[PDB]
Amino acid sequence: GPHMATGQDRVVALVDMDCFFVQVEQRQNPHLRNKPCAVVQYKSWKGGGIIAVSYEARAFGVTRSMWADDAKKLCPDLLLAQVRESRGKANLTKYREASVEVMEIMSRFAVIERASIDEAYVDLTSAVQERLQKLQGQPISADLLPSTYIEGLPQGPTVQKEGMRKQGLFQWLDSLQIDNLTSPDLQLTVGAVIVEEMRAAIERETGFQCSAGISHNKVLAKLACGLNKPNRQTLVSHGSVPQLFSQMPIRKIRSLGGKLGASVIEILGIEYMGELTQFTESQLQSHFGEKNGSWLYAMCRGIEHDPVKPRQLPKTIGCSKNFPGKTALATREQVQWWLLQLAQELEERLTKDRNDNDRVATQLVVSIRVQGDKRLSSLRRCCALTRYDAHKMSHDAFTVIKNMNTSGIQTEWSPPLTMLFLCATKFSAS
DNA sequence: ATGACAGTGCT
């Protein structure tokens, strides 16, 4: 009734750079622009691993995870850009620096949470209030929303994509100006206007295109972002949620794409997010735990409270390398050389981080994987990170893992190592 | 023989 919270208190956006690593390489090499293109990591084994794919290449069936030799079978004209290799390993510095470019532009408009190297959540609630004052009750023109889709529209009583988009936007804005929508709907709409301006600034100032979702919380904003790509943005209103969720597979909602989502499907015998509304909160808690149950109860009604955290910078700075199949590290000299390679990249990134961001890491996490273990990590151990010195970090890492060598000799390493991982964590102001 | 990243939550 009048005491039922509807989760309409915030305006939240999720901005996602379209096939980001590809765009970085296309900006640098114009010959790659507007072509089927992919970014490949390494090159010797089966042509290298594809890690990013342009939308033109996706139309041929090229996907991430694919071996480049296989991608070329689907797309013979596929162009490839190679990830930089330094100290024997893939080095993602170019993409990290490009991400900083975008995040600094986004930070001019609103509070941002860096979700990944190319996604940020945006809390627009305050900016929308400000913009609503300036407008002075003047209606919002469709020209302010030139790339916005309104999910669920058009409805009721053109066979072209852009024409559908405009029809839906007109229906939305017409009902807005007649006062047939709600005050949260107006807030979302102003939020979308700001996101158009943010995306325009990103493209003008970096060359990069992005897509975005605008809704009342992070889960709906992320879901919204994926509905119309590339280079478009989608507004998911609270009212659109029942129809949207009625055929939405549970795995599409963030945090339900793995084992928990699979258990929701199996235990409850349902397929779609909207089907969750038929269970009580206590029922859901009894199957999935207190926290998950409460979260699911609210989420299937379009409600989520997870805040956009004010976090511009990554919380960890890590370096890793796999050694699959025959390349597994089988000797002590190997392990120490590679630990040094990883530690040297980490030292370089850590020193740069300290200069730019006035912070120092205090913990070094060391993880390895041994040949045979089905889990991605076999062992994780931490030690103090007291100096940004690669030779010290590599020695400390060796010290904390050396006991895992169950081999007879000190010169051999068994069972061989299929992964080394160093991660600097626990940052303090400096 | 996807890799190389990253953040959150459990116990």
Added chain:
DNA sequence: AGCACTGTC
């Protein structure tokens, strides 16, 4: 603290 889980390009 060490690990499992979930997500990114």
